[PDB]
Design a protein around this ligand. Structure first.
Ligand SMILES: [Mg+2]
Ligand SMILES: [Mg+2]
Ligand SMILES: [Mg+2]
Ligand SMILES: [Mg+2]
Ligand SMILES: [Mg+2]
Ligand SMILES: [Mg+2]
Ligand SMILES: [Mg+2]
Ligand SMILES: [Mg+2]
Ligand SMILES: [Mg+2]
Ligand SMILES: [Mg+2]
Lengths: 103, 101, 100, 140, 166, 97, 275
RNA sequence: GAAAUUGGGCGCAAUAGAUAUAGUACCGCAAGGGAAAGAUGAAAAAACCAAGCAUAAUAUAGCAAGGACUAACCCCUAUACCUUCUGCAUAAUGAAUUAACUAGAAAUAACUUUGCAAGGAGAGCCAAAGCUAAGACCCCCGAAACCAGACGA
């Protein structure tokens, strides 16, 4: 609800639209298991579309870690220091490609 | 809806605008332009020859997770649903005006 | 032992030299391999010299010498996915590590 | 007990994280919390119809407050801004009255000129030429 | 069972810099399983909760309750500990910062009632925790004057915005 | 607070045990062993259900008939009471008729 | 003991979140954390700002002076920052006055110099530097990076951009990141003035206009604890400003501020900056 | 309801599993009923999480919240839940609260999916597309009683 949860005012980071638009992602960090069915779509995202993604915005520096995890995570870090760590566990390739473009 | 819009401000719309972040957008359908000493107001819109309201796109977020719960007493009727409506944020860059009167 | 195989540039005449050793006639690419011994002597000479054996799943697909020619001019390359990704012309903000 | 529930702690905290700001034992005891957390969620969605009602009632009470400063009533302003095809809604008209009172004085001047053009057309029945601000713009 | 209050006297802070004010001593002390109830101890623990240790020993010598004879045994052992073990030079330079009472492990006996029915009588026990901080006691908070109520009202008028608009 | 504070010791399962690596051998001893043995002769368990599947009433009827002559004295009385109960449940109670 | 593993694992990770909500750790800088490559973050630093640097000359803009001393201290157990930071501080002072003397010509050189000291102060630059990932890339000794060093690192980036792409691209880098920090801010929230009534007598004497006669235009509830006055500043019986206040002295001290804004061109309804 | 005839664990792990640490303590004249519970470490010859409280009593107004808000309350909106009913805020039932335990068991026929097919099925049985195999539907607590055998004046 709204009386339980905090609230804020609609703002931007550093007047993000006035002079120029600065892309607000700094990093994406993928943990992706080499053997594991939970990261089946996450392996196909790295194989197919993370190279098309890392050229569409050269300000985001992307780290694919590739360690033996059960749950693959994506750790989006932004320009104001905020960290939004989300999971791509058992998601198809079309569902990670919109989850990352949302980030 | 109708947004009272000045320059260098922000607007939050509750739908995806199928745009890229950063694309400058000319908002048509201006229907009242005012200054400290005059105002011009259309019938019902001002012409495109007269006003040019620019807007960038900053962020294409989702809303905060926003609950829909249904309940009826003594009927075992209880539903819960959590929706996040997609949102976009426009920054109005300039309200130019041209002498076409 | 290494699974990698590059098709030689003269495998057209290298296979033709092995057909003339196991037999010769005109249109040498349409010789039917219906004989069990004749398919053995041809494919053992190719697998020993070139170092690439026909798998049991693909051994029945070879009814002609045309089909033996098509198998030996496709390049297989079995390397790790680390070496496949990190040598696939990464843009300068892709960093890939392997904890294995 | 072959398989009994091992994760019942996290099902309680799905409800009890919404109740942390309550009073009494509704913030602690789970049996008392679900009858209020459910009831706090139904009120959260039934008040999406009352926010749009209570904002428009607020906008009407802020247009009625500012139109009385120029001697207009509320139905004499909205009814004659429509007749000039000035399709401003209640949100902007209540935000013009606070933040731009010169423009709102011009909309009260326009809605009173059209009102006087509506009376002068009505007292002079029969065919008379229309008022100046009473001419509609047609779209085809 | 837990005994975390006894272990707070073993925290060793790093040795101080001379460009830093002197850290006051803290002396955590407790007695467990006092045959007295935990909410009859609260009236004695609330009484001494801001006082200096010499005024606390004065107001407990003349209280008629049972626990005042027990707190005065706790406050005297914690004052003797502060000059011995925790390096306070003055006995009089202490005040009670925290003075609470938890419940202890209570025993159960049978109380017979007037018929075949009965009740379950519980023999109450309690704890008493104290912390002495080295220093003079801080002064009690005065009531906020009419100047301070007028500032808060004018600051509440000054802070209000035009709500539900631009 | 019914949840443990320390995570349990790790379950090490040898997937190449004797009973695991040779599991399933001779389940087709009929159809490629000249049908001398049925695979129902390969299952080891109680006498009254070596190659037989029934519900709870048909199991207690079969246990009383096959091995009930040598059952213990208050295990036979606990079984006779169970068939006397499961008769009345399956034949008189229930939703569908 | 309820058998199983998946619920005992989740509770082990809800205890570790509560161990950081009860005892939060000290902040560690970004380079001592996983997933960090210092060469790749600088090339991503350039393309993020839609501008291109000479990447070796940008690498020397981030290494400070205190870092080289404490890199030689641990060597018992590189260029500095000052050259590029002096070019960037000196240019962005003359670039910002050229921006503000062109948009506000009526403002005096006292008020322009007090505007550049706001736009290049520690409150604006170290707020701008923390949201362009300059603290992440800077090489200092102590963390969090002190605002005296982070301001030196930010102007070294502008100094490095001057040598990379000339003074045309660099003035657009100052226009988009330093001049945007005055949006919505009043003039005297940037240029704090003691005695604005006496500063208005000096400026009205500059235009050869009469000294203003402060006149009480409107008032309400003078005998209460919540009064409202409207002191207007009339000169030659024509007002230049009116101002509100709780008393007459505040409403007169504020009516000089409204007339000072109307003289220097810094009103609330002035023409906004062009981008 | 016949007969001829035919021939070690996809268990429990201290409210579980035995009632069982024990048929002990305790209860009854007796037959009989019948519990509860323990957790260090290689060696003792070495924290964080329930209810409940405390830290820290309370400020006009009302199902204890929600919309909100600069702001905890003030403003506006809102007649707890379950069960039973024509219909319950009902002044109808149940419930102090926490932790744990506590309630849908199966047939022919149909359906779905395979195998094989005028045949199917590892004898028996069915078959005018059938037949074999699988999957999928049938609760918990509660009387006053009745009878048999002991134990009690
Ligand atoms: Mg009691
Ligand atoms: Mg027979
Ligand atoms: Mg037991
Ligand atoms: Mg608690
Ligand atoms: Mg009310
Ligand atoms: Mg009713
Ligand atoms: Mg009731
Ligand atoms: Mg009833
Ligand atoms: Mg009751
Ligand atoms: Mg007698």
């Amino acid at each position: 609800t709204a009386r339980g949860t905090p609230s804020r005012f609609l703002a931007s980071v550093l007047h993000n639209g006035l002079g120029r638009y600065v892309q607000q992602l700094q990093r994406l960090s993928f943990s992706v298991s080499r053997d594991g069915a939970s990261s089946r779509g996450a392996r196909e995202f790295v194989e197919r579309e993370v190279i098309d993604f890392a050229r569409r915005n050269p300000g985001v520096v992307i780290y694919v870690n590739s360690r033996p995890c059960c749950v693959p995570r994506v750790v989006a870090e932004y320009l104001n220091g905020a960290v939004r760590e989300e999971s791509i566990h058992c998601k198809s390739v079309e569902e990670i490609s919109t989850l990352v473009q949302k980030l | 809806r109708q947004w009272k819009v000045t320059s260098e401000d922000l607007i939050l719309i509750g739908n995806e605008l199928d745009l890229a972040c950063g694309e400058r957008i000319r908002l048509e359908k201006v229907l009242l332009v005012g200054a400290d000493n005059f105002t011009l107001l259309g019938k019902p819109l001002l012409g495109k020859d007269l006003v040019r309201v620019e807007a960038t796109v900053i962020e294409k977020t989702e809303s905060w997770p926003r609950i829909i719960m249904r309940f009826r007493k003594r009927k075992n009727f209880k539903k819960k649903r959590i929706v996040t409506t997609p949102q976009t944020v426009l920054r109005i860059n300039s309200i130019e005006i041209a002498p076409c009167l | 032992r290494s699974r990698a195989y590059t098709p030689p540039e003269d495998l057209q005449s290298r296979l033709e030299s092995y057909v003339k050793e196991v037999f010769l006639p005109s249109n040498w690419q349409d010789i039917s391999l219906e004989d069990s011994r004749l398919k053995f002597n041809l494919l053992a000479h190719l697998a020993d010299d070139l170092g690439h054996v026909v798998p049991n799943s693909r051994l029945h697909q070879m009814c002609r010498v045309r089909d033996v020619l098509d198998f030996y001019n496709v390049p297989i390359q079995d390397r790790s996915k680390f070496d496949e990704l990190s040598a696939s012309n990464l843009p300068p903000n892709l960093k890939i590590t392997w904890s294995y | 007990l072959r398989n009994r529930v091992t994760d019942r702690y996290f099902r309680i905290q799905e409800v009890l994280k919404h109740a942390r700001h309550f009073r009494g034992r509704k913030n602690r005891c789970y049996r008392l919390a679900v009858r209020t957390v459910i009831r706090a969620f139904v009120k959260c969605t039934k008040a999406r119809y009352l926010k749009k009602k209570n904002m428009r009632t607020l906008w009407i009470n802020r247009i009625t407050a500012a139109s009385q400063e120029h001697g207009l009533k509320y139905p004499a302003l909205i009814g004659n801004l429509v007749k000039c095809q000035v399709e401003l809604n209640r949100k902007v008209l209540a935000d013009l009255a606070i933040y731009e009172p010169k423009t709102f004085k011009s909309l009260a001047a326009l809605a009173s000129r059209r009102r006087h053009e509506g009376f002068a057309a009505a007292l002079g029945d029969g065919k008379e030429p229309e008022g100046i601000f009473s001419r509609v713009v047609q779209y085809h | 069972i837990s005994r975390k209050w006894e272990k707070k006297n073993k925290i060793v802070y790093p040795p101080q810099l001379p460009g830093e004010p002197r850290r006051p001593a803290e002396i955590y002390h407790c007695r467990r399983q006092i045959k007295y109830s935990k909410d009859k101890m609260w009236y004695l623990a609330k009484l001494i909760r801001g006082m200096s240790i010499d005024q606390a020993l004065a107001q407990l010598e003349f209280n008629d309750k049972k626990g005042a004879k027990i707190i005065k045994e706790v406050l005297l052992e914690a004052q003797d500990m502060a000059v011995r073990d925790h390096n306070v030079e003055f006995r009089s330079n202490l005040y009670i910062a925290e003075s609470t009472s938890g419940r202890g492990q209570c025993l159960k006996r049978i109380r017979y009632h007037g018929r075949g029915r009965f009740g379950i009588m519980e023999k109450v026990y309690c704890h008493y925790f104290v912390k002495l901080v080295e220093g003079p006691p801080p002064p009690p908070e005065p009531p906020k004057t009419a100047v301070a109520h007028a500032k808060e009202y004018i600051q509440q008028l000054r802070s209000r915005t035009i709500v539900h608009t631009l | 607070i019914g949840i443990r504070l320390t995570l349990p010791p790790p379950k090490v399962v040898d997937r190449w045990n004797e009973k695991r690596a040779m599991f399933g051998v001779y389940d087709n001893i009929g159809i490629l062993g000249n049908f001398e043995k049925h695979p129902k002769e390969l299952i080891r368990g109680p006498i009254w259900l070596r190659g037989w599947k029934g519900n709870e009433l048909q199991r207690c009827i079969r246990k009383r008939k096959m091995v009930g002559s040598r059952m213990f004295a208050d295990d036979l009385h606990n079984l006779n009471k169970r068939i006397r109960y499961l008769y009345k449940h399956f034949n008189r109670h229930g939703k569908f008729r | 003991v309820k058998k199983g593993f998946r619920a005992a694992f989740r509770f082990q990770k809800e205890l570790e979140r509560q161990r950081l909500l009860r005892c939060p750790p000290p902040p560690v800088r970004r380079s001592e954390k996983p997933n960090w490559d210092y060469h790749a973050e600088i090339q991503a630093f350039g393309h993020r700002l839609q501008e291109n640097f000479s990447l070796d000359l940008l690498k020397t803009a981030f290494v400070n002076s205190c870092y080289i001393k404490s890199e030689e201290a641990k060597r018992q157990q590189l260029k500095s920052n000052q050259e590029l930071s002096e070019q960037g501080t000196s240019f962005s002072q003359t670039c910002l006055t050229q921006f503000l003397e062109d948009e506000y010509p009526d403002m005096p050189t006292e008020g322009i110099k007090n505007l550049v000291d706001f736009l290049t102060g520690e409150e604006v630059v170290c707020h701008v530097a923390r949201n362009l990932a300059v603290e992440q890339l800077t090489l200092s000794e102590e963390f969090p990076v002190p605002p005296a060093v982070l301001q030196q690192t930010f102007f070294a980036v502008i100094g490095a951009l001057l040598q990379s792409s000339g003074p045309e691209r660099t003035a657009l880098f100052i226009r988009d990141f330093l001049i945007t920090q005055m949006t919505g801010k009043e003039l005297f929230e940037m240029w704090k003035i003691i005695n604005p009534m006496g500063l208005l007598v000096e400026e009205l004497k500059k235009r050869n206009v009469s000294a203003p006669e402060s006149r009480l235009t409107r008032q309400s509830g003078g005998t209460t604890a919540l009064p409202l006055y409207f002191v207007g500043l009339y000169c030659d019986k024509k007002l230049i400003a009116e101002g509100p206040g709780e008393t007459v002295l505040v409403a007169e001290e504020e009516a000089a501020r409204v007339a000072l804004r109307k003289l220097y061109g810094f009103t609330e309804n002035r023409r906004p900056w062009n981008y």
